[PDB]
Design a protein around this ligand. Structure first.
Ligand code: A7R
Ligand code: A7R
Lengths: 374, 374
């Protein structure tokens, strides 16, 4: 078989020879009982850079020693990209949401041998599922591989915005001291009201991590949590999003992007926020109107905004969230820590081994098989 | 009835006219039951900048309407300072540990009217206690006012160091993207081993906030925690610090500085740390050999160091910790958020009202009284 795998670029100084540490913490299962990936073997050491072109998700020896071919590229955009060239006879396509190779209807029509569309990570929005259903292509992803990673990133950003970490560190780095300059915008998080807009895997993991900070927890979602869970975390439920914003000091978005949530944070809905609110968005860039957010921070309607998701992505060089007041942005990285990469490279190999050996792919990995069967 | 009060400078662009939010979260008590300060009244709005020269801890109208004088300065260092000149007849001296007016033996000898040494915050380290005992000066502090603030700062720095937040935010800020450059030094915190060197007010608050991150918790102390707390937080006790270091991925220092702890982190003890360990130090700068820490980051033995405490303070513009690799420094600020300032400005006024009216200062505020430690 031919496996076509799209990854992001190696670092500026090259593929790293050494790493900061030797191994990764041992983990058995995700919250809720789903066990971590179980490939038969792996050909990488956990903690290596796996999501760049030279990392190859640790796949080449396993594939080439089994008669398969592996094409790894970072060129994914347009009809004359390496990706679209190699796609016509590829059996398997793999990409990460951090550099996704879009499987449009027209691309899937051209992919004569395509049988498996694999997401190395979480989030198959780059794959047209109706075309996969019609064409009998399996669509899978490494469920849960980076939900905890993103949750950590969220709480880190909450603390950093509220306490004014990033300008304070800049004073230290640039040779200043300037205590009043640092803390004129610095508060404690304690006893603030903090809401999450969804509360699925990331939203719940964020709520658990916030609880011992003695914040008052709020959430909204289409489907209420078991009030057993509501009782343990002392959650206030809001049936609608617009009800939750006004009572929150901090709001984190952990909701999927689709037409009803597109630009859900806009000039109109930002006026429902308490003056000086904080928003953290590690979900999707287009949940927020780019310029409404920028206006809110210049006017002080928000006192901070942080996230790793942008629109468009990758963010253009002059994108306003890069330099607006009190931003805590990173590039799109939160689910591709070296830790997460080890889990989803292993998950990728587990799915490939099942697929080539004709064994069942884990039901929790599946999105499409014959039909929208998860 | 002369109050000499030393505060830090206003922000470089002047004392603020507006603030990010209108109020502060409501808090009743500290962990363990101690109530927040209870002055008869306050002449500030909580959330205002009170610890700088124009904030005056909100004290002027209360002192002056009672016939006292208030002298506020930021010039405190050495014999030619405003502070030394005003000290000769001050009855009350007030100082924050973020900008401390040192009451050395020689200075206290010159302070002919000195009756009360008040710390606007936590940490009588700047006051020679034997001199205060010998001269019957009362020494008091606003106990617990910023313990939670520092604990939040610790967890914030741990997450930032492990996930490589600060260089990632620089890539975003400067117009780049560079996913592999961001994450070649980024890990999850989950299931790491994290140890605190002591488990007092801050150390226990740090441990409680770390628990839902699913880390493995470790601690040292002269006195063990109660067995019920050990099992509630699933703590591993270590009898010596040196016995704790080799199993920790993260070590946070929450211990006072005195001879047995000075330079306790040095070229020799650093060889006990795991490769790629992180250190956070919001305690005191001189707990660490300054150049040994920098050497350990330059040579790749430590994956990160962060804190808000330095030696000396303020840090000179070329202090090595400002620019050494993988540092997360701020200036000394973690206990002077606008939230914390509101508590210790209220407590400062409470203590002053007690002292001038002859009512007993709270026992938990007292360090020295009546010629003895108390
Ligand atoms: N590297 C990254 O930045 C990164 C990494 C991983 C994932 N993601 C992003 O992609 C999403 C997945 O996040 P998720 O938590 O992993 O997904 P899920 O568990 O299915 O979500 C809970 C659900 O919310 C729902 N819902 C749905 C529609 C609606 N109109 N209202 C609702 O309320 C429904 O009820 C359910 O609770 C976003 O969260 C965001 O994180 C980004
Ligand atoms: N803005 C800031 O950065 C800031 C703010 C407030 C305070 N501070 C700093 O000044 C200290 C107070 O911190 P603390 O936790 O408030 O003080 P405490 O409750 O008395 O300490 C727990 C004790 O540890 C002890 N101990 C002692 C000696 C020894 N050889 N072994 C031990 O084990 C003993 O056992 C007990 O548990 C440092 O911690 C650091 O935080 C910094």
């Amino acid at each position: 078989a031919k496996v076509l795998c799209v990854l992001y670029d190696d670092p500026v100084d090259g593929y790293p020879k050494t790493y900061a540490r030797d191994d990764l913490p041992k983990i058995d299962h995700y919250p809720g009982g789903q066990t971590l990936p179980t490939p038969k073997a792996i050909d990488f050491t956990p903690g290596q850079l796996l999501g760049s072109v030279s990392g190859e998700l640790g796949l080449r020896k396993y594939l080439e020693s089994n008669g398969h071919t592996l094409v790894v590229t970072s060129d994914k955009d347009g009809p004359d990209s390496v990706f679209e060239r190699e796609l016509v006879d590829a059996d398997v396509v793999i990409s990460q949401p951090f550099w996704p190779a879009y499987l449009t209807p027209e691309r899937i029509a051209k992919a004569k041998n395509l049988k498996l569309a694999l997401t190395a990570g979480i989030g198959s929005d780059h794959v047209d599922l109706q075309s996969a259903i019609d064409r009998n292509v399996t669509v899978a992803e490494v469920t849960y591989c980076n939900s905890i990673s993103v949750a950590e990133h969220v709480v880190m950003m909450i603390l950093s915005l509220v306490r004014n970490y990033l300008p304070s560190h800049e004073w230290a780095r640039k040779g200043g001291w300037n205590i009043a300059d640092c803390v004129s915008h610095a508060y404690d998080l304690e006893a603030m009201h903090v809401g999450t807009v969804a509360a699925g895997r990331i939203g719940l993991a964020v709520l658990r991590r916030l609880a011992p900070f003695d914040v008052h927890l709020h959430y909204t979602d289409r489907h209420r949590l078991p009030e057993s869970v509501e009782k343990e975390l002392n959650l206030t439920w809001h049936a609608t999003r617009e009800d939750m914003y006004p009572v929150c000091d901090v709001v984190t978005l952990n909701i999927p992007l689709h037409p009803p949530t597109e630009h859900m944070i806009n000039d109109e809905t930002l006026k429902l926020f308490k003056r000086g609110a904080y928003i953290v968005n590690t979900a999707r860039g287009k949940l927020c109107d780019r310029d409404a957010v920028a206006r809110a921070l210049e006017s002080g309607r928000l006192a901070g905004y942080a996230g790793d998701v942008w629109f468009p992505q990758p963010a253009p060089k002059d994108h306003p969230w890069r330099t607006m007041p009190y931003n805590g942005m990173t590039p799109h990285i939160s689910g591709t820590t070296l830790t997460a990469q080890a889990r989803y490279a292993a998950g990728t190999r587990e799915i490939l081994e099942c697929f080539f050996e004709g064994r069942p792919i884990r039901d929790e990995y599946l999105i499409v098989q014959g039909g929208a069967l998860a």
